[PDB]
Amino acid sequence: MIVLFVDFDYFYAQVEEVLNPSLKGKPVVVCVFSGRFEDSGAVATANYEARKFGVKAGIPIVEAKKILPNAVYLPMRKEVYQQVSSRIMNLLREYSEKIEIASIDEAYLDISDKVRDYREAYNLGLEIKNKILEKEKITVTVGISKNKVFAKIAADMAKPNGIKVIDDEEVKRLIRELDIADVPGIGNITAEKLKKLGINKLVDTLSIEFDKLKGMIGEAKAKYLISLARDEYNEPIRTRVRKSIGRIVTMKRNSRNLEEIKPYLFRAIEESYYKLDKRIPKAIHVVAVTEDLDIVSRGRTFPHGISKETAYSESVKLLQKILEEDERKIRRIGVRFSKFI
DNA sequence: TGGAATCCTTCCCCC
DNA sequence: GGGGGAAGGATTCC
Ligand SMILES: Nc1ncnc2c1ncn2[C@H]1C[C@H](O)[C@@H](COP(=O)(O)OP(=O)(O)OP(=O)(O)O)O1
Ligand SMILES: [Ca+2]
Ligand SMILES: [Ca+2]
Numbered sequence A: 001m002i003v004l005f006v007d008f009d010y011f012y013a014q015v016e017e018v019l020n021p022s023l024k025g026k027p028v029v030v031c032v033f034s035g036r037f038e039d040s041g042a043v044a045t046a047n048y049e050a051r052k053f054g055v056k057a058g059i060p061i062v063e064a065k066k067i068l069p070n071a072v073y074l075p076m077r078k079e080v081y082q083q084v085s086s087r088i089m090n091l092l093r094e095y096s097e098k099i100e101i102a103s104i105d106e107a108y109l110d111i112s113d114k115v116r117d118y119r120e121a122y123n124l125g126l127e128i129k130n131k132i133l134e135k136e137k138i139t140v141t142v143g144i145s146k147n148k149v150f151a152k153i154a155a156d157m158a159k160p161n162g163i164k165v166i167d168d169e170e171v172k173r174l175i176r177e178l179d180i181a182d183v184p185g186i187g188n189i190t191a192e193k194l195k196k197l198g199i200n201k202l203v204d205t206l207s208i209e210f211d212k213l214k215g216m217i218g219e220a221k222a223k224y225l226i227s228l229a230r231d232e233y234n235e236p237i238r239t240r241v242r243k244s245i246g247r248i249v250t251m252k253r254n255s256r257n258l259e260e261i262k263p264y265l266f267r268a269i270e271e272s273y274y275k276l277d278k279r280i281p282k283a284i285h286v287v288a289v290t291e292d293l294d295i296v297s298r299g300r301t302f303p304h305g306i307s308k309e310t311a312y313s314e315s316v317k318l319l320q321k322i323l324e325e326d327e328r329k330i331r332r333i334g335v336r337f338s339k340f341i
Numbered sequence B: 001t002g003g004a005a006t007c008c009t010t011c012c013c014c015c
Numbered sequence C: 001g002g003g004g005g006a007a008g009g010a011t012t013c014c
Helices: A011-018 A061-067 A078-092 A118-136 A148-158 A170-177 A188-195 A210-217 A219-229 A258-276 A308-325
Strands: A003-008 A028-033 A041-046 A072-075 A099-101 A106-110 A140-145 A163-165 A244-255 A281-290 A295-301 A330-340
Touching: A003 A078, A003 A118, A003 A148, A011 A028, A011 A041, A011 A078, A028 A061, A041 A061, A061 A072, A078 A099, A078 A106, A078 A118, A106 A148, A118 A140, A118 A163, A140 A148, A148 A163, A148 A170, A188 A210, A210 A219, A244 A258, A244 A281, A258 A308, A258 A330, A281 A308, A295 A308, A308 A330
Parallel strands: A028 A072, A140 A163
Antiparallel strands: A003 A106, A003 A140, A028 A041, A099 A106, A244 A330, A281 A295, A281 A330
16 A cells, blocks of 8 residues: 655646746735725735745735735636646546546545555656656645555645655654644644644544544544554545535625625526536535625525526525525625536 | 535434 | 434535
């Protein structure tokens, strides 16, 4: 068992660089304009030029202009990055058949049937970093170990433009040494529960009675951290498929009025239906982001697939259900479509 | 901001 | 008691 994990660096920004090389050397910030005010929006990502000054994914765009008033700010062109990504995936598909496409910018490859050890793996690493640098002009970080979680961690250490092997002895210290907050799947809310439980490192997971751990963070998560800690996590590489498709959009004002919201909602369905493209959903959800950034959703499953005129009419009922059941104003509104035939 | 997975808890119908 | 749903929310990650 030997897993290789690949992670395209500062991806959306690097793609705008590849597309206009003049941009190299300059701090680049790829933004998502919400279009309420001027520069209402958030940061989708920035190159390391910008990132070293605090500008990063999820700070408002106004906050990023106060730090770097002369950086280059580009609106997000997703469809573009979506295609460049595909082309690269295809490249890796020739390095192995066992390949999990994790996100727009990550993939793990099972390379047992291709390689004999951590030296031969390394070489395959550089063989690939190179081939992507060559064909597509994009730098990636490569992390390597016995499973996916440690391949990913390896990569976090080695970024950007890095390559790294975490071998079976280094995994051993890391269970003791690694801060559990730095484990994939443990976000701020689990990190805090785990601290008040006495777990700051991966290895303190064993010192607790399981059923207390289950009681704090869930079973699924508890079994995960446990197996990880017993050098015993070993989930395989899967070809995961889209389970849902949707679209959420921001209104120029916060509103409670049904006629004010509807056309935002209809545009969301429209784009959603395009994105489906010969896919037929059985489930529609209406998601609202209320004025204080809380998220409330109402939905419905059908026995048949959903056509557009049915998605139109049913979506308005579920939005009604939200206004009725929740007293707050509405900042964002959209749809998600799941349960494909 | 915008997208999408997965888990958990609760409710329900019913052997 | 338990299987099998669905629905709504919570959490994470990119
Ligand atoms: N919070 C976000 N909001 C919008 N888009 C995001 C967000 N996070 C990530 N993305 C998008 C843009 C990123 O380029 C892409 C990949 O994310 P990610 O791999 O974590 O970091 P990154 O590619 O920007 O740089 P890095 O090399 O540091 O990981 O997904
Ligand atoms: Ca990356
Ligand atoms: Ca974290």
